[PDB]
Amino acid sequence: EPRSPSHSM
Amino acid sequence: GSHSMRYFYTSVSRPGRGEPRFISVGYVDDTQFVRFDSDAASPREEPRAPWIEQEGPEYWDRNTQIYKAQAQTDRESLRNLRGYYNQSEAGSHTLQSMYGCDVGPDGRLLRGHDQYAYDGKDYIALNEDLRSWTAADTAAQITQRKWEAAREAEQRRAYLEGECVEWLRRYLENGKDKLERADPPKTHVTHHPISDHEATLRCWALGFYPAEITLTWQRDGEDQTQDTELVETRPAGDRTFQKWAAVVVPSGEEQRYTCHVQHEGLPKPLTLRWE
Amino acid sequence: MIQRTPKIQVYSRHPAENGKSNFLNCYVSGFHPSDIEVDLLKNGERIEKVEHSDLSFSKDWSFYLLYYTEFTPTEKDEYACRVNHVTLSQPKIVKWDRDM
Missing domain, CATH: 3.30.500.10 (MHC class I-like antigen recognition-like)
Structure with missing residues (x-):
């Protein structure tokens, strides 16, 4: 399963 | 694994x-x-x-x-x-x-x-x-x-x-x-005359998984690295992979050449000939 | 900006047998950016309802796609793949050879 969304760059 | x-x-x-x-x-x-x-x-x-x-x-x-x-x-x-x-x-x-x-x-x-x-x-x-x-x-x-x-x-x-x-x-x-469980390649050698004096031998590996494979042509059991045309491993579209290796040889010398196949799915490395 | 020229291979899923249903594949790889046009041609004409794999990429970040269609090879029908990309000054046409 995918990772939860990252902080923006 | x-x-x-x-x-x-x-x-x-x-x-x-x-x-x-x-x-x-x-x-x-x-x-x-x-x-x-x-x-x-x-x-x-x-x-x-x-x-x-x-x-x-x-x-x-x-x-x-x-x-x-x-x-x-x-x-x-x-x-x-x-x-x-x-x-x-x-x-x-x-x-x-x-x-x-x-x-x-x-x-x-x-x-x-x-x-x-x-x-x-x-x-x-x-x-x-x-x-x-x-x-x-x-x-x-x-x-x-x-x-x-x-x-x-x-x-x-x-x-x-x-x-x-x-x-x-x-x-x-x-x-x-x-x-x-790795799926071994289905293998065969084809032969294509170019002229009266030269022919292509092509060693095929089809339907294998995973993609990692090694195909080498040998002349009397010695690798022909610098003379082999090797295509990049490519998807068949059914989740398996394909690759071929080809060598141009003198007409009548085909019997000196063997294709060596290494794949995780093979019980042991294969040696193939034109046959 | 990085631009990498596509590699192209055209081939059938199974060894070709005239009159036997098969798949025609055009594998484009090693390219950047991802914007690319790939047509499968039958006797020089664009094949409709051609499908492609989901956009993926290699560890060097270069993209790869498989374009494919169900087909029945014959003696006379000629097949090819036509690719347009920012790196190509003209369309690259690779002819299908059942022996490659």
Whole structure:
């Protein structure tokens, strides 16, 4: 399963 | 055996034509098992291997919401990165993401991966320690300081040691022989006269999985490296792979040449001839 | 900005047998950026309802796609793949050879 969304760059 | 899980994201800006297109794919080893496309009519994570189809609605619903949120986050990232690089707001740019886990036969984590490229160039990557970043330039250092302040590495490490390893273990259990047992190549040699004096011998490997393979031509059991035409390994379209190796030989000397095939699925390395 | 020229291979899923249903494949790889046009041609004309794999990439970040269609090879029908990309000053046409 995918990772939860990252902080923006 | 040893196994990997990888997610690959591609975001491509298109200023003037709306929000960037976001595409995700997921792989176990060389098998694609999921996709998401933000331009689809009703975007959702979709299965692409049979053994993932048994995951319940909660799985698909969770993952779909993740990709939708990640698409918006990548949109913000593309806006920030054209700012960091002082780039025109008219042009199209690419943000790629690649993450996942390598595990051994016991399912234990060997290595985590979390890294990024901007316009095809390495930008930032989580180090092997899963606790520190390598930034390519002063732009990527802006991202690094933002991610250090937000404790991003701990979030990535939790996933890579946790959900990544546990879900890969699950997929290997449900994918059984499709993921654990290599499929050996079906092999044959073809012969193509060029002239009265030269012929091509071509050694074929078809229908093999995973993609790693070695094909070599030998003359009296010595590798013919500098004289072999070798095509890149290519997908058959049915989740298996193809490759061939060819050598041009003097007419009547074909019997001196053997093709050697090395693949995980073979009980032992094959030696093939024109026959 | 990085630009990498696509590699192209055209081939059938199974060894060709005239009159036997098969798949025609055009594998494009090693390219950047991802914007690419790939047509399968039958006797120089564009085939409709051609499908492609989901956009993926290699550890060097270069993209790969498989374009494919169900087909029945014959003696006389000629097949090819036509690719357009920012790196190509003209379309690259690779002819299908059942022996490659």
